[PDB]
Design a protein around this ligand. Structure first.
Ligand SMILES: CNC(=O)CCC(=O)N[C@@H](Cc1ccccc1)[C@H](O)CN(CC1CC1)S(=O)(=O)c1ccco1
Lengths: 99, 99
């Protein structure tokens, strides 16, 4: 799809078998989801945003279907204000900015 | 133009008498610029993201050129670690996400 930016670019994702809403976020390096359970091993990590650093759990090689497009990659879980799809997965689904 | 997301989508912007590098950020409702001493009236505001909130100064109807595209709108100024072009200006320059 082509998505204009008058509204937040929120899309439905499927991850760990469950549907969630998430923000397509070109200003995010990484994909960060609100507190949830995911299978497998994770590693403690820290990331910075506006207003400082948080602790997250890093899950590697996690499949997510983003608006009907398949990705498999790193998913961080922690106290983000909203579920965000970052560049690591935006690139996988062929997402570009155009003007 | 088309901008892929392998790296941060940083572009040159012009505001006041200053050229700066700023993120084209679909995840940002607002445009947030690093500390700069702009003339004119402003209103205090708080904005938040991953690591919590920061204090900013809200300036309205500020002309800003992004990648040679003119825009005019609200600019928040404060201790952000990166210059952020939010959806309020991305819409003005005709920016879309596409996949
Ligand atoms: C490893 N770090 C990241 O991936 C950054 C994730 C992030 O917080 N991105 C911000 C933009 C940003 C990038 C780098 C440093 C600081 C900020 C995101 O794209 C825009 N934010 C809102 C989205 C998290 C929901 S925001 O907090 O910066 C913002 C922008 C305007 C008002 O708030």
């Amino acid at each position: 799809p082509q998505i204009t930016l008058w509204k937040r670019p929120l899309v439905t994702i499927r991850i760990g078998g469950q549907l969630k809403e998430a923000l397509l976020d070109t200003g995010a390096d990484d994909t960060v989801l609100e507190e949830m359970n995911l299978p497998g091993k994770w590693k403690p990590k820290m990331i910075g945003g506006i207003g400082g650093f948080i602790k997250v759990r890093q899950y590697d090689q996690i499949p997510i279907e983003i608006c009907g497009h398949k990705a498999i990659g790193t998913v961080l879980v922690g106290p983000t204000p909203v579920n965000i799809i970052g560049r690591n997965l935006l690139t996988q689904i062929g997402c570009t900015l155009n003007f």
